[PDB]
């Protein structure tokens, strides 16, 4: 039955491709061509955050749009007050090889991990006056590339072993294991309502997972190389991916297919991070050519360039209120653009 | 600023003070990446190593330097995490000369690390291990069992020179040096070789990129 199953799988792939083609009545660039362009967007740095002595790998905004957490290879995880550029907390790590970090939506906990293969969760609002490790979540057999909190008790992580997992922080055990990728998983993005998430991997594909059921509902393909960053569109019906093809792509969840490709002939450098503005009109992406481009998400025009870094831009994010964009790079600085 | 903001600033300054102190303490270490074939002997390259599965970090002290050796084996997944070691001062590469079956694999590994975009100018310290077995094995399996494209004596000195030449042939950038050293399983004089190679490496890097 092995050949029959292989033929059935190929027939199903053809059926899916034909279904996707049938729905492609028009593309985004043929609909939005009548909308006034956003024009040139010129942003300036308003704050520079200094203190790390090594490459910064991850950065995440809190839900108050004022505090942010960053992690670097010097063994520190630092919580910053973005309005005054004060350091609020500095957490030493047991392993300096940190890939990701996260800031709980309540502001009570932070999390990070990397090569150790352990996701550590730190309790910030503690008695005794000092930040301490609350949990160490072990179970993955590869590096942790991304982790995001759903609530103070649930965290979802992505690993280098091709698996994603939903963890119960208090129990310390995995609750849901998400399998189906072939390559390592590089990025994770939660839906606005926490019910779904999208993961990107080195298979040049992304999968949409149902947090409660554990199954993959959709698989999106189109990139030629590894996908390093995924971000949901603010309304939850679309997401953008960045890859080593020097291309970003906007995918629609309802049409089950790619809607827009963001590329330029003068860009031959990879994409390290993606994000959207509060309204969804601007798409931001960090590149390993030491700058960050701002794209018009509806026309695929380049709206502007942020270019204050001396090394690879490793991370970026946008505040929940849309007031500012923060970036981090391998030059050990963070910058806030507005 | 209010009284609470002044106190917050004082806290921030104490945080910065401790961050600088830790940066200084960490700035005295020499970071070495350790790569090699399975069972190459890399785990015993230095008899003084302490261990303190992901990355296995070992360390030792010698003279007035603190050496931190990172074994990368646990991450059986690599370009996705190798750039974390871009700033290592040197790469130690271990080759087992006795086991012919592990060769070619070790040549592909050497070529891959030598031409990695993040290690194009990072020097390599190449250790050829178990010469005490190779020198006897060669009298029964005279190299051609492993490197059939060889025209030469079936002797210890010439087979060793040929293997070293094969490893050095993978260096395609004039800005990188490869150091070679022959060791025995019972040879304890490895800390001196690493120390001297690192000293020459740091000097060369101080002069190159200085516009010399």
């Amino acid at each position, epitope marked *: 039955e092995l050949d029959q199953l292989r033929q059935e799988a190929e027939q199903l792939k053809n059926q899916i491709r034909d279904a996707r083609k049938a729905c492609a009545d028009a593309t985004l660039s043929q609909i939005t061509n009548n909308i006034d362009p956003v024009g040139r967007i010129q942003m300036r740095t308003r704050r520079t955050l200094r203190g790390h002595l090594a490459k910064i790998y991850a950065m995440h905004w809190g839900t108050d749009s*004022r*505090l942010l957490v960053s992690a670097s290879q010097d063994g520190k995880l630092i919580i910053w*007050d973005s309005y005054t550029t*004060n350091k*609020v*907390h500095a957490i030493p790590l047991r392993s300096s090889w940190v890939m990701t970090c996260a800031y709980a939506p309540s*502001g009570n906990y932070v999390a990070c991990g990397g090569l150790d293969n352990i996701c550590s969760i730190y309790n910030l609002k503690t*008695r*005794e*006056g*000092n930040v301490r490790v609350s949990r160490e979540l072990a179970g993955h057999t590869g590096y942790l590339s991304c982790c995001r909190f759903l609530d103070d008790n649930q965290i979802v992580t992505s690993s280098g072993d091709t698996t994603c997992a939903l963890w119960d922080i208090e129990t310390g055990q995995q609750t849901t294991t998400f399998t189906g990728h072939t390559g390592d998983v590089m990025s994770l993005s939660l839906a606005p309502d926490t019910r779904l998430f999208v993961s990107g991997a080195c298979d040049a594909s992304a999968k949409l997972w149902d947090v409660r059921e554990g199954m993959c509902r959709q698989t999106f393909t189109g990139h030629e190389s590894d996908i390093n960053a995924i971000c949901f569109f603010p309304n939850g019906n679309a997401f953008a991916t960045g890859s080593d093809d020097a291309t970003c792509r906007l995918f629609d969840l309802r049409a089950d297919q790619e809607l827009m490709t963001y590329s330029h002939d003068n860009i031959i450098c990879g994409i390290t991070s993606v994000s959207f503005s509060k309204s969804g009109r601007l798409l931001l992406a960090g590149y390993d050519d030491f700058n960050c481009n701002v794209w018009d998400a509806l026309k695929a025009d380049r709206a502007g360039v942020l270019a204050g870094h001396d090394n690879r831009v490793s991370c970026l994010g946008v505040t929940d209120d849309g007031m500012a964009v923060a970036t981090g790079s391998w030059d050990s600085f963070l910058k806030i653009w507005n | 600023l*209010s*009284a*609470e*903001d*002044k*106190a*917050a600033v*004082e*806290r921030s300054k*104490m945080i910065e003070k401790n961050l600088k102190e830790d940066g200084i303490s960490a700035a005295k270490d020499v970071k070495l990446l350790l790569l090699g074939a399975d069972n190459s002997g890399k785990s015993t390259i230095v008899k003084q190593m302490k261990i303190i599965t992901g990355i296995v970090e070992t360390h030792f002290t010698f003279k007035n330097l603190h050496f931190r050796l990172f074994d990368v084996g646990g991450q059986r997944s690599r370009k996705k995490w190798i750039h974390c070691f871009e700033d290592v001062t040197a790469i130690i590469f271990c080759v087992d000369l006795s086991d012919y079956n592990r060769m070619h694999e070790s040549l592909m590994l050497f070529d891959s690390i030598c031409n990695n975009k993040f290690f194009i100018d990072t020097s390599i310290i190449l250790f050829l291990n178990k010469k005490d077995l190779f020198g006897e094995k060669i009298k029964k399996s005279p190299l051609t069992i492993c490197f059939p494209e060889y025209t030469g004596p079936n002797t210890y000195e010439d087979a060793a020179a040929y293997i070293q030449a094969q490893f050095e042939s993978k260096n395609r950038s004039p800005n990188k040096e490869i150091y070679c050293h022959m060791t025995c399983a019972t040879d304890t004089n490895n800390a001196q070789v690493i120390f001297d190679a690192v000293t020459d490496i740091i000097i060369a890097n101080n002069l190159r990129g200085c516009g010399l």
Partner: single-chain antibody
Amino acid sequence: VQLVESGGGLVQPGGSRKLSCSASGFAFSSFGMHWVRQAPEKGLEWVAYISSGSGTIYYADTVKGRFTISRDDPKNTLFLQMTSLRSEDTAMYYCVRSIYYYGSSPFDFWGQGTTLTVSSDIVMTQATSSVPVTPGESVSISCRSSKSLLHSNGNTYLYWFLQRPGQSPQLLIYRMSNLASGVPDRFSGSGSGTAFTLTISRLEAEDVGVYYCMQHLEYPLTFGAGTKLEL
């Protein structure tokens, strides 16, 4: 978290004594420390402050030049060396910890006091000295200040404390509206510049004592006279 006071006792006028607070169960070196005193039948009065790292030291102007405040982090011990003691220095002395960072809650944990017996400022005014109360009642306690406590950074630096009979006071509300950890949601604070209110809904038992207003906008820190509830 524990703070234990020592020293004190009966001293003749003109002498000197050292008070000492032993801290346990917390990262003492990360907290600033305050001394607060309460005259036998009066309200609370601030005495002195040392910031973390001993960078900043402040004194009340009634003790300045006579008292020295110091700390010894390796032994988690705070000291106050008092000279030229006067009959007005008779009081219960409390050691209070505070930590300052964005979102922090200073003056949260107060220790037990020690009893010493000797043989420009913003004025806080309590609306009333005493409010009879009945359990199951809504009680509103209010204060006024001589200067607005609303700063340009958006924060209002008003604190509410409750001193139950026989106990050191505990923090109820910080920055005019932020309920302290461990305090039930029965308490609520509100106000505007120069005018503040504390509302207690569904008053319960062990909810009776003296309520104090404190400003923390600028040193020296001042307290109101205190409003007593009774059943």
